[PDB]
């Protein structure tokens, strides 16, 4: 009963589709070909039906033939139709076959090496990981000698891609078959002078192994450096570059500590910085950039001074390979603790500001990222004030391209250092540059928008004297009437709202509120959300009636805004309505608040969790301001309306009252709602008490004995739906009153909840099973097992089916807690049942 077939699996889909009789008339062991169709069953079929094929092939690969098995398994995954899950399944199958066919995988080494090699060089990380795993499995299948004899003659591939693939294959084979297991063979086959191909492939395999292993290069660090030091003074520049790359990879893998083996080539690395030419000096600098942070504190200064002769001199890079390498080396040197801030400010600050700190890289994305990262890393060491008073020009420049990177670096420095290193003239220059960048925002540059808030936060109390500048800036950016411009202005105002409005001014509040409530009908939902956020920030910073928009006008104006279906707009409007009743909170007619609550009650279960949280955060203050009795009566009347598709949320609103007011605000009012003889009235009351005790928290311990009879009367033999509600209430109240000293009422409720265990309803047992699983963990097995012990061997076959299930549910929980709870099973004459090892008197 496998699933349907597919035209993509037509390579071996003739078993279940055609009369491919491998046992009637076919070659020897032709059924293994049908096993490929079984592989389709592993791909096309069920999870257990797919794993059964692998479980069977695991005990049949030895009796299937290595040749045909490989010839049918390799092309199956070699095709481009190998999906991600399909690739994983094929890799697992090949690994199982190799674990079964260990010595048989030797003749097929030429196959997987030609197949797993490209897959290991794929683009996706999962593909490379699967290729490396397949290569490691193939290596572990046969011996190291087979892998050596396979990867050694493969060096004749003159193609650079083929050579790199062979080097990566050898590195993967050595990373799993033992690094020192293949180290001597590789060192003996690569130490010769055949040609540049082998000399390059040696360093390539070394770097590939160091990159694939990772932190596992600590013991084999010197063992590999002993063979890699033959290229540090190599004649050919290509071999020298390969050796430098391998040394840098090893230093990065074995970093930061353990620079002992690095001293074996540390002298040439520190000498040849200003000795090589072009690619040689580039490779030397790239290796020194990694060796510097791993170096010690004494020789680090000497190495930096020896490398600066060729680093600071060639800071201006004709190409990108030199510029990026120099930037990385400078970043690594700044990260090192050797060169102090004084040396950087003396010999590193002026060169970095002259050759690097400029608008000459306003279009290089990689350069714009590298220079920004290096500046952000070096600002913490050279002082933020040393750069805050020296980068106030690139942002104010008319070139917006370099201005974006300058603002990004300034924001990064402000976020890293903070606001301590901020001079008066430096602060004024930074404010002027930020204002010029924000005003001259001809493009969509979010860097300035993100940095304005950081600068305002760094201002702190200094933003008060600088109030009118930012005020006029925000006014010019808000009255521009541009969509994206207004959005960015509202965002920047909401970010820097608490810093400016909360400065104890009482003068800009009106000027802000007049423009805030003006553009209330923005068609763009993002602009509307930004305006709502700005108004919320103003209401949080301003008060009643300190806020410019009147409360009696902003409330009815914001009322229809909450009815919108926009996600961000509604999310902001909920918080705005909540904060409207934050400080003073009256500012409304009771009918308006009741209507707002009735409208928001339908949004308490929205898809976005943010709206669900904001609704509960606002309804609490709404109910605290309106009143307990009115809100309770409204919620109770709302229980019958809004039929059970969104009715339960209303019950949650009642719980919000319990979370918004004292427990006696909803308890006595909801108690009278049970006196009605209606079935789905008491049912709704119980469904509401469930969420009430599930969300009331640790407050149930204060009042739990007064609600015991209300749950007991509902737990009686009343109906089939009035039983799950009482059990859920009990389970959600026991967990909430866990260990708080209310076990009496818990026992009172359990006395009734136990007889309801005998229920054949498949949908009604879980309501009691969960109650028992909660009572076991909130009561202790010393009493639950005491109840459940009388029937552990009851004669009824359908009575033990529930008692053993409850015992299992009470066993995995409190496994060793119930050990000192069992009775003394007396000793029979056929064994030793009594546990006499616990009846000592000592």
């Amino acid at each position: 009963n496998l699933p349907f077939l597919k035209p993509d699996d037509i390579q071996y889909f003739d078993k279940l589709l055609v009369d491919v009789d491998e046992s009637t008339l076919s070659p020897e062991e032709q059924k293994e070909r049908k096993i490929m169709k079984l592989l389709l069953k592993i791909k096309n079929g069920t999870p257990p039906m797919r794993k059964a094929a692998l479980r069977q092939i695991t005990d049949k690969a030895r009796e299937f033939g290595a040749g045909p098995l490989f010839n049918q398994i390799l092309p199956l995954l070699m095709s481009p139709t190998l999906e991600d899950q399909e690739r994983h399944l094929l890799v697992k199958v090949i690994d199982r076959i190799l674990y079964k066919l260990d010595d048989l995988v030797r003749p097929y080494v030429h196959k997987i090496l030609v197949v797993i090699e490209p897959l290991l060089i794929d683009e996706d990380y999962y593909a490379r990981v699967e290729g490396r795993e397949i290569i490691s499995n193939l290596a572990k299948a046969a011996g190291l000698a087979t892998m050596i004899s396979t990867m050694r003659p493969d060096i004749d591939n003159m193609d650079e891609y083929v050579r790199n693939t062979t080097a990566r294959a050898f590195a993967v084979v050595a990373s799993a078959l033992g690094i020192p297991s293949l180290l001597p063979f590789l060192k003996a086959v690569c130490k010769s002078k055949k040609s540049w191909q082998a000399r390059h492939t040696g360093i390539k395999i070394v770097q590939q192994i160091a990159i694939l292993m990772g932190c596992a290069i600590l013991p084999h660090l010197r063992s590999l450096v002993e063979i890699i030091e033959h290229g540090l003074v190599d004649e050919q520049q290509k071999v020298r570059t390969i050796s430098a790359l391998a040394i840098a990879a090893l230093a990065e893998a074995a970093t930061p500590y353990g620079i002992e083996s690095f001293d074996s080539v540390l002298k040439p690395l520190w000498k040849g910085i200003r000795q090589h030419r072009g690619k040689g000096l580039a490779a030397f600098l790239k290796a020194i950039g990694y060796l510097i942070p791993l170096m010690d504190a004494e020789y680090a200064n000497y190495y930096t001074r020896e490398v600066m002769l060729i680093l600071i001199r060639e800071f201006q890079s004709p190409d990108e390979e030199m510029k990026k390498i120099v930037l990385k080396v400078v970043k690594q040197c700044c990260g090192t603790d050797g060169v102090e801030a004084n040396y950087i400010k003396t010999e590193i600050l002026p060169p970095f500001f002259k050759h690097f700190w400029q608008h000459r890289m306003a279009l290089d994305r990689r350069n714009y990222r590298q220079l920004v990262d290096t500046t952000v890393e070096l600002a913490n060491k050279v002082g933020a004030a040393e750069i805050i008073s020296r980068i106030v020009d690139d942002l104010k420049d008319e070139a917006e391209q370099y201005r974006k990177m300058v603002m990004e670096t300034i924001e990064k420095i402000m976020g890293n250092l903070g606001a301590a290193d901020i001079d008066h003239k430096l602060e004024e220059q930074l404010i002027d540059g930020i204002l010029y960048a924000f005003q001259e925002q001809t493009t969509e540059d979010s860097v300035m928008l993100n940095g304005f808030g950081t600068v305002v936060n760094a201002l702190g109390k200094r933003v008060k004297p600088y109030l009118p500048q930012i005020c006029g800036t925000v006014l010019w950016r808000l009255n521009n009437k541009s969509a994206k411009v207004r959005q960015q202005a509202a965002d920047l105002i909401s970010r820097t709202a608490v810093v400016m409005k909360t400065c104890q001014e009482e003068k800009l509040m009106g000027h802000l509120g007049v423009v805030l409530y003006e553009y209330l009908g923005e068609e763009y939902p993002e602009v509307l959300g930004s305006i709502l956020g700005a108004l919320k920030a103003i209401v949080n910073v301003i008060g009643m009636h300190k806020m410019t928009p009147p409360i009696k006008d902003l409330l009815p104006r914001l009322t229809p805004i909450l009815k919108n279906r926009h996600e961000k707009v509604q999310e902001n409007c909920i918080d705005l309505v909540g904060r409207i009743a934050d400080r003073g909170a009256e500012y409304v007619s009771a009918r308006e608040w009741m209507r707002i609550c009735f409208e928001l009650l339908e949004l308490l279960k929205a898809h976005k969790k943010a709206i669900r949280r904001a609704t509960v955060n606002t309804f609490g203050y709404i109910a605290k301001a309106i009143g307990p009795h009115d809100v309770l009566a409204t919620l109770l009347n709302n229980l019958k309306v809004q039929e059970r598709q969104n009715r339960v949320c209303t019950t949650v609103a009642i719980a919000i009252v319990a979370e918004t007011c004292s427990p006696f605000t909803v308890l006595p009012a909801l108690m009278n709602e049970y006196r009605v003889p209606e079935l789905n009235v008491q049912n709704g009351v119980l469904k509401s008490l469930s969420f009430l005790f599930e969300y009331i928290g640790e407050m149930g311990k204060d009042y739990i004995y007064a609600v015991t009879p209300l749950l007991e009367d509902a737990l009686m033999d009343r109906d089939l739906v009035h039983r799950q509600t009482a059990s859920a209430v009990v389970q959600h109240m026991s967990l909430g009153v866990y260990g708080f000293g209310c076990e009496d009422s818990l026992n009172h409720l359990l006395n009734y909840v136990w007889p309801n265990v005998f229920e054949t309803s498949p949908h009604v047992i879980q309501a009691v099973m969960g109650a028992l699983e909660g009572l076991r963990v909130a009561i202790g097995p010393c009493r639950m097992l005491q109840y459940c012990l009388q029937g552990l061997f009851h004669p009824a076959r359908k009575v033990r089916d529930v008692y053993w299930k409850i015992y299992n549910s009470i066993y995995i929980g409190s496994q060793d807690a119930l050990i000192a709870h069992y009775p003394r099973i007396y000793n029979d004459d056929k064994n030793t049942y009594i546990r006499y090892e616990l009846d000592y008197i000592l």
Binding site: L792, F793, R797, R800, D801, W804, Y807, N808, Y811, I812, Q815, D816, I819, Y822, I825, D828, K830, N831, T832, Y833, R835, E837, L838, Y840, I841, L842
Partner: protein
């Protein structure tokens, strides 16, 4: 393996229940401290002695039909 090991089911024999009882009651003896420093005071043996005794008793205690 670890599906439900530790307890039987609807027709679990009394012996097979007491066997799991003792087999999971000694692990609270070899692991717990008060119930291990208390048994080495009664039997008057060291921790290693009592622990090895309890470990060897986990072969088939309670009276094994072996």
């Amino acid at each position: 393996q670890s599906k439900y090991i530790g307890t039987g089911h609807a027709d679990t024999t009394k012996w097979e229940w007491l066997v799991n009882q003792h087999r999971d009651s000694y692990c609270s003896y070899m692991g717990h401290f008060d119930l291990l420093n208390y048994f080495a005071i009664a039997e008057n043996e060291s921790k290693a002695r009592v622990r090895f005794n309890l470990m060897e008793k986990m072969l088939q205690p309670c009276g094994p039909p072996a």
